Amino acid sequence: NDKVRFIKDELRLLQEPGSYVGEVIKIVSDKKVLVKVQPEGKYIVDVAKDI
Amino acid sequence: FVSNSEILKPFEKKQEEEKKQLEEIRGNPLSIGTLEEIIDDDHAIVTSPTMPDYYVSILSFVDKELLEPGCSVLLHHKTMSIVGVLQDDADPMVSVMKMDKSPTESYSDIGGLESQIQEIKESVELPLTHPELYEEMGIKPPKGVILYGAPGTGKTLLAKAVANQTSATFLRIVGSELIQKYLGDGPRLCRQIFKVAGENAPSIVFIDEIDAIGTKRYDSNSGGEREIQRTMLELLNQLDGFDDRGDVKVIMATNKIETLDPALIRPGRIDRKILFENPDLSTKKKILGIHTSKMNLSEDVNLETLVTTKDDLSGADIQAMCTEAGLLALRERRMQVTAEDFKQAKERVMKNKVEENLEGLY
């Protein structure tokens, strides 16, 4: 039951589109961070509520 | 009570409502780009690093006076609208290299030039720190000074102490970095240096060790014969191509200004010629006393003896003998440096490289 539940829980993680890769450039007080993606350009994105 | 409820309460409430409206503007679908041109119709074309084409309108909080071609504005992912003006993305990353805020320098190490120190102060320190001097009398302050003389006189340290009194940014330029050979590129780097000095207006422009290519003297970055024309005349086109009354003050310094182009001198901008000379024996005690303040001297060591021995030496040669004599006692683990180390230091440092003229008596 734990093996089937683990494989089932890991199935939705592989079906997730995933995430890009980037590096933090600068931060502000608006909770918006500039992340530089290597293949793409620089994008200012909002930080998560957990961090 | 009455005023605080009608001011502080609606202010904090309105600021929270403005941030909620930013979700459709500054929210997660957010991107950037490079501004190209602006039109009177409240529309512009901006290109992101992915090379798209976005033609949209202009949002609030920003006017067209802050929007300049070549800068980096803020875009949107879906609506693709231009948000507002921003500084250089990630910045040029030029903070302290040739420029700083308040360098630490005094007039003691540059002592001996006091005859020529009052010339640079009245033409630089006085008009910048005390602008009422030339305004009340209506006179025009000198817009630049030229530096000429033998090395080791504290050429860089001369303008370094003045920058601390003016409490302004002190710019510097390397002579070899402008003539760097990529393809052309000589005049292109020159404009970026003076452009930064125009935005903040530090009112201080200095260049240390003007070199370029007199003849060759380089390997990796050459530039050829065409680099001499596009470089030395580019510094001229800064003063000759713009008229700035009270702000930009260009100061040029190098070892020999005679071989330079007389047009590069740009007469009428620099009305002061400062010559450098070695300090005499009277001013050597001020420099020697600072380096020997933390040094342990023996009972047979006299400060007046080391000054008399020094003949035709620069400011770095005073601290050199203290460094050489200090290492001799450091290898033997001695507290007070013996007089024999001072004697061997003043005699050796005197003649090292060229002992003789190699031919005849001259």
Give me the phi and psi of B215, to 5 degrees please. -140, 115
Amino acid of residue B104: T
Q: Does residue B266 contact residue B239 with C-beta atoms inside 8 Å?
A: yes
Q: Does residue B339 contact residue B322 with C-beta atoms inside 8 Å?
A: no
How many whole angstroms separate alpha carbon B228 and alpha carbon B213?
A: 7
Beta bridge partners of B338: none
- CA proximity to B311, closest of B332, B284, B291: B284
Nearest CA in chain B to A43: B31
Is B127 marked as binding a ligand? no
How many whole angstroms separate alpha carbon B296 and alpha carbon B299?
A: 10
CA distance A34 to chain B (A): 8
How many whole angstroms separate alpha carbon B135 and alpha carbon A23?
A: 52
| Residues of B in Cβ contact (< 8 Å) with A34 | 89-90
Beta bridge partners of B57: B43
Give me the phi and psi of B235, to 5 degrees please. -65, -30
Beta bridge partners of B205: B171, B250
Amino acid of residue B175: G
How many whole angstroms separate alpha carbon B146 and alpha carbon B251?
A: 6
Which residues, 6 or more positions from B67, have their beta carbon under 8 angstroms from its beta carbon?
A: B35, B38, B44, B58, B73, B85
Do the Cβ atoms of A34 and B48 come within 8 Å?
no
Q: Is A20 on the interface with B (CB under 8 A)?
A: no
Amino acid of residue B230: R
How many whole angstroms separate alpha carbon B142 and alpha carbon B197?
A: 19
Q: Does residue B73 contact residue B33 with C-beta atoms inside 8 Å?
A: yes
How many whole angstroms separate alpha carbon B117 and alpha carbon B110?
A: 9
Beta bridge partners of B257: none
Q: Is B289 on the interface with A (CB under 8 A)?
A: no
Cα dihedral B101, B107, B111, B116 in deg (nearest 10):
70
Nearest CA in chain A to B23: A46
| Residues of B in Cβ contact (< 8 Å) with A41 | 31-32, 48-50
Q: Does residue B175 contact residue B185 with C-beta atoms inside 8 Å?
A: no
Q: Does residue B218 contact residue B187 with C-beta atoms inside 8 Å?
A: no
Edge-to-edge strand ranges of the sheet holding A22-27:
A22-27, A32-37, A42-46
Q: Is A39 on the interface with B (CB under 8 A)?
A: no
Q: Does residue B127 contact residue B134 with C-beta atoms inside 8 Å?
A: yes
The residue behind tokens 């030229």 is B146
Q: Does residue B218 contact residue B178 with C-beta atoms inside 8 Å?
A: no
What letter does residue A50 receive in the DSSP assignment?
Answer: T
| Residues of B in Cβ contact (< 8 Å) with A26 | 90-91
How many whole angstroms separate alpha carbon B324 and alpha carbon B326?
A: 5
Beta bridge partners of B174: B208
- CA proximity to B291, closest of B327, B264, B318, B259: B318
Amino acid of residue A2: D
- CA proximity to B81, closest of B18, B20, B22: B22
Q: Encoding tokens for residue B292?
A: 């020997």
Amino acid of residue B247: D
Which residues, 6 or more positions from B61, have their beta carbon under 8 angstroms from its beta carbon?
A: B84
Q: Containing H/E element for A15?
A: helix A2-15
Q: Does residue B298 contact residue B149 with C-beta atoms inside 8 Å?
A: no
- CA proximity to B255, closest of B269, B234, B236, B276: B276
Measured in whole angstroms, how far is the alpha carbon of residue B38 from the centre of its chain? 34
CA distance B70 to chain A (A): 17
How many whole angstroms separate alpha carbon B16 and alpha carbon B10?
A: 10
Q: Which technique was used to obtain these atomic coordinates?
A: cryo-EM
Q: Containing H/E element for A36?
A: strand A32-37
- CA proximity to B205, closest of B145, B255, B155: B145
Q: From the CB of residue B179, how many other CB atoms can be counted at a distance below 10 Å? A: 23
| Residues of B in Cβ contact (< 8 Å) with A30 | 26
3-state class of A46 per DSSP?
strand
Do the Cβ atoms of B31 and A43 come within 8 Å?
yes
This PDB structure is determined at a resolution in Å of: 4.5
How many whole angstroms separate alpha carbon B205 and alpha carbon B216?
A: 27
What letter does residue A5 receive in the DSSP assignment?
Answer: H
Give the 3-state DSSP-derived string for chain B, with helices as H, strands as E and coil as C: CHHHHHHHHHHHHHHHHHHHHHHHCCCCCEEECEEEEEECCCEEEEECCCCCCEEEEECCCCCCCCCCCCCCEEEECCCCCECCECCCCCCCCCCCCCCECCCCCCCCCCCCCHHHHHHHHHHHHHHHHCCHHHHHCCCCCCCCEEEEECCCCCHHHHHHHHHHHHCCCEECCEHHHHCCCCCCCHHHHHHHHHHHHHHCCCCCEEEECCCCCCCCCCCCCCCCCHHHHHHHHHHHHHHHCCCCCCCCCEEEECCCCCCCCHHHHCECCECEEEEECCCCCCCHHHHHHHHCCCCCECCCCCHHHHHHHCCCCCCHHHHHHHHHHHHHHHHCCCCCECHHHHHHHHHHHHCCCCCCCCCCCC
Orientation angle between helical segments B186-199 and B226-240, nearest 10 degrees:
20
CB neighbour class for B35 (10 Å; exposed up to 12, middle 13-18, buried from 19): buried
Amino acid of residue B159: A
Is B175 marked as binding a ligand? no
What letter does residue A18 receive in the DSSP assignment?
Answer: -
Q: From the CB of residue B88, how many other CB atoms can be counted at a distance below 10 Å? A: 11
Beta bridge partners of A45: A33
Do the Cβ atoms of A25 and B31 come within 8 Å?
no
